[PDB]
Amino acid sequence: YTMSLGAENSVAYSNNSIAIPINFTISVTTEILPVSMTKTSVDCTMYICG
Amino acid sequence: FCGKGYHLMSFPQSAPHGVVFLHVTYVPAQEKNFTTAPAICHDGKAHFPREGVFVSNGTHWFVTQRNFYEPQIITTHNTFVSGNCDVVIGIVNNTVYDPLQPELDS
Amino acid sequence: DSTECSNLLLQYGSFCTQLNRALTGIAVEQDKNTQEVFAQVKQIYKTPPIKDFGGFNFSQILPDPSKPSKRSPIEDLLFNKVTNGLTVLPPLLTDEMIAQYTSALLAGTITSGWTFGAGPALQIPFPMQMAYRFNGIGVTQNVLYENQKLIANQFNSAIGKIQDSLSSTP
Ligand SMILES: *[C@@H]1O[C@H](CO)[C@@H](O[C@@H]2O[C@H](CO)[C@@H](O)[C@H](O)[C@H]2NC(C)=O)[C@H](O)[C@H]1NC(C)=O
Ligand SMILES: *[C@@H]1O[C@H](CO)[C@@H](O[C@@H]2O[C@H](CO)[C@@H](O)[C@H](O)[C@H]2NC(C)=O)[C@H](O)[C@H]1NC(C)=O
Ligand SMILES: *[C@@H]1O[C@H](CO)[C@@H](O[C@@H]2O[C@H](CO)[C@@H](O)[C@H](O)[C@H]2NC(C)=O)[C@H](O)[C@H]1NC(C)=O
Ligand SMILES: *[C@@H]1O[C@H](CO)[C@@H](O[C@@H]2O[C@H](CO)[C@@H](O)[C@H](O)[C@H]2NC(C)=O)[C@H](O)[C@H]1NC(C)=O
Ligand SMILES: *[C@@H]1O[C@H](CO)[C@@H](O[C@@H]2O[C@H](CO)[C@@H](O)[C@H](O)[C@H]2NC(C)=O)[C@H](O)[C@H]1NC(C)=O
Numbered sequence: 001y002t003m004s005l006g007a008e009n010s011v012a013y014s015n016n017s018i019a020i021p022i023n024f025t026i027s028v029t030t031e032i033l034p035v036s037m038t039k040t041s042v043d044c045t046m047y048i049c050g
Numbered sequence: 051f052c053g054k055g056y057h058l059m060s061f062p063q064s065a066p067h068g069v070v071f072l073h074v075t076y077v078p079a080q081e082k083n084f085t086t087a088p089a090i091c092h093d094g095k096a097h098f099p100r101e102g103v104f105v106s107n108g109t110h111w112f113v114t115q116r117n118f119y120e121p122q123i124i125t126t127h128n129t130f131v132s133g134n135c136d137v138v139i140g141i142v143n144n145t146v147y148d149p150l151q152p153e154l155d156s
Numbered sequence: 157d158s159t160e161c162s163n164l165l166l167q168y169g170s171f172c173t174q175l176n177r178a179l180t181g182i183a184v185e186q187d188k189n190t191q192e193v194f195a196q197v198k199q200i201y202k203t204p205p206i207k208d209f210g211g212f213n214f215s216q217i218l219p220d221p222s223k224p225s226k227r228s229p230i231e232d233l234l235f236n237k238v239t240n241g242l243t244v245l246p247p248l249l250t251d252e253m254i255a256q257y258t259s260a261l262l263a264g265t266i267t268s269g270w271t272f273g274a275g276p277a278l279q280i281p282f283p284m285q286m287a288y289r290f291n292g293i294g295v296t297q298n299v300l301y302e303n304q305k306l307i308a309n310q311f312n313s314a315i316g317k318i319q320d321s322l323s324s325t326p
């Protein structure tokens with residue numbers, strides 16, 4: 001299929017209307033970031049020549 | 051930068067070769083329409099919100115904080131006066147309460 | 157197409173697999189980069205049909221209905237001003253979809269300010285939003301409201317100068 005970017009949301013803009021929240025959600029989200037790699041050492045003489 | 055929404059705090063967690071951040075954020079919800087105005091015209095003076103916004107539920111005007119609905123009476127203390135009502139486009143007429151008025155009334 | 161060359165090439169091992177894997181990683185990385193930059197909203201916001209923004213003109217940055225590509229005049233100018241076993245893979249996001257993402261971001265930031273980036277899109281009049289931005293930089297709301305026509309004229313003039321500067325500089 002042809003992918004859809006997102007659901008359409010037409011914001012009701014007018015010159016004298018505002019939308020004020022009456023409630024809130026305490027949302028906890030996860031962010032995973034790599035920090036380090038496996039520390040690998042290669043003996044060049046032993047790798048090439050044994 | 052620290053999660054989706056208005057960031058409140060974050061908690062670090064160790065992970066194999068990595069870190070996991072638990073971002074605690076504040077998300078607005080249950081929004082409601084209100085009629086808004088840039089300024090309030092009272093006694094030939096223009097009043098602007100100090101820290102909030104003017105909202106109207108249909109018949110009465112209040113000033114509330116931008117991120118949560120908490121209507122309060124438009125007083126002298128929470129508004130600042132700058133100029134008359136002839137300059138600001140879209141200014142509406144409403145009374146501005148004075149908390150000093152009952153003190154000298156009594 | 158030489159069989160003998162491929163037979164000799166097999167003596168060198170998995171070099172070809174390494175090179176193909178690295179190129180594939182770069183190719184998927186470019187699409188990931190485009191997703192990270194442009195696909196930051198899951199709602200496709202649209203502007204109201206009446207462009208009443210309190211004197212602010214956004215015609216040079218909003219999409220042009222007359223153009224088949226649905227691009228802005230600035231975006232159209234930008235696209236006009238940029239000119240043996242090898243294959244070029246198409247990007248995952250086409251130009252019209254990227255333009256649609258930019259249009260959604262523009263509609264969100266015009267009709268809702270910064271609210272759409274932190275949660276549900278909350279409508280606000282554009283002068284009031286500009287006043288909030290003025291308060292962010294330490295200038296009172298009254299300055300914005302009193303000089304609204306001047307600020308709108310300056311903004312329109314600056315946007316026009318941006319279009320002229322892009323069209324006039326190689
Ligand atoms: C704001 O939303 C919260 C949702 O967390 C509402 O809390 C719920 O209220 C209902 C009605 O009494 C309860 O049945 C739920 O158990 C509550 N949920 C929690 C997590 O406590 C809250 O009432 C809403 N407030 C307003 C003013 O709409
Ligand atoms: C604020 O008012 C506007 C205008 O009445 C509402 O926008 C309409 O909402 C209805 C209900 O779903 C839709 O059928 C219309 O298509 C909407 N119009 C537009 C231009 O989008 C809006 O929903 C109201 N917001 C709140 C929070 O009540
Ligand atoms: C807007 O909010 C105000 C403040 O709550 C409403 O005024 C109250 O209305 C109730 C119901 O008639 C009365 O019992 C209260 O005494 C009123 N308070 C004051 C200070 O007058 C007002 O009715 C609301 N308007 C709408 C359209 O909902
Ligand atoms: C808000 O109050 C002002 C102040 O009275 C109103 O301006 C008056 O409008 C009438 C009708 O045109 C004129 O006869 C007066 O001379 C005006 N007075 C001033 C000081 O300008 C204004 O019309 C009111 N607005 C609303 C919507 O009620
Ligand atoms: C916003 O700015 C655009 C571009 O400057 C205005 O469009 C011009 O309108 C005049 C008069 O109608 C035409 O002669 C020009 O050819 C138009 N230019 C373009 C590029 O279309 C537009 O009128 C301004 N105002 C609004 C409300 O959109």
Ligand SMILES: *[C@@H]1O[C@H](CO)[C@@H](O)[C@H](O)[C@H]1NC(C)=O
Pocket residue numbers: 015016139140141208
């Ligand atoms: C909003 O626009 C209408 C006409 O479309 C106008 O009559 C009204 O005064 C405007 N309100 C503000 C606050 O600009």
